[PDB]
Amino acid sequence: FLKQLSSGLLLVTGPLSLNRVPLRRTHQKFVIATSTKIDISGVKIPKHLTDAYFKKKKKYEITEQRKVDQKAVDSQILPKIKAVPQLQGYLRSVFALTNGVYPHKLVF
């Protein structure tokens, strides 16, 4: 999670190398909030990207501005998640429920 946008959606972005997830909006209700935090206090989010930047325009091809902003933000995050051991493997993994696993019983 990066920041709270204007309309209430969450600007959430895992690294594209690990999660294969771009700078993408996500509603806060359909979100499991894991109590695992990194320090993004010292990153520089671009001000030009906003809710209107992620608004659907009208076949989707990736613009070169999206690619530049993808590596502009990931370059600040990816060194920081490498400071926490086994965090990149945690992000590459997928979340699922197995036998005997109950979300109400476990904490996260």
Partner 1 sequence: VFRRFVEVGRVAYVSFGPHAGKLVAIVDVIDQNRALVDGPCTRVRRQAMPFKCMQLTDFILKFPHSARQKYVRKAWEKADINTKWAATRWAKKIEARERKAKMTDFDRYKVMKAKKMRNRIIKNEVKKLQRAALLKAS
Partner 2 sequence: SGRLWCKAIFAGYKRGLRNQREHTALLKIEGVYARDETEFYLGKRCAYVYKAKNNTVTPGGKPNKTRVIWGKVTRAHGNSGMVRAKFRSNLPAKAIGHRIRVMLYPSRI
Partner RNA sequence: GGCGGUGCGCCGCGACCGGCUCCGGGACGGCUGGGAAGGCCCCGGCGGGGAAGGUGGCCCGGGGGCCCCGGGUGUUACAG
Partner RNA sequence: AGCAGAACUGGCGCUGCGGGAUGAACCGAACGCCGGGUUAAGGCGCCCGAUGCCGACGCUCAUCAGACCCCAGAAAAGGUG
Partner RNA sequence: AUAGCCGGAGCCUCGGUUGGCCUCGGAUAGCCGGUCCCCCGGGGGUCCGGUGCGGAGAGCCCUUCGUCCCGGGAAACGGGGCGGCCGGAAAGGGGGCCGCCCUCUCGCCCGUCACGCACCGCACGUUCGUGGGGAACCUGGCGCUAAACCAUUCGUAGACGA
Contacts with RNA, residue ranges (CB under 7 A): 8-9, 16-22, 24-27, 29-30, 54-58, 60, 62, 66-67, 70, 82, 85-86, 88-89, 92-94, 96-100
Q: Between residues 47 and 101, which has the closer beta carbon with respect to RNA?
A: 101
C-alpha 108/C-alpha 82 separation (Å) is 21
- CA dist 8 and 81 (Å) reads 26
Please say which residue, 41 or 98, places its beta carbon nearer to partner 1: 98
Nearer to partner 1, 18 or 49 (CB): 18
Nearest by Cα to 76 from 41, 25, 37: 41
Binder of partner 1 out of 89, 96, 102, 104 (CB under 8 A): 89
Q: How many residues does the chain have?
A: 108
Closest CA to 33 of 82, 95, 105, 100: 95
Q: Are 86 and 53 in contact (CB under 8 A)?
A: no
Q: Contact residues for partner 2 (CB under 8 A)?
A: 29-33, 94-98, 102-105, 108
- Give the interface with partner 1 as residue ranges (CB under 8 A): 34-36, 86-87, 89-90, 93, 95, 106-108
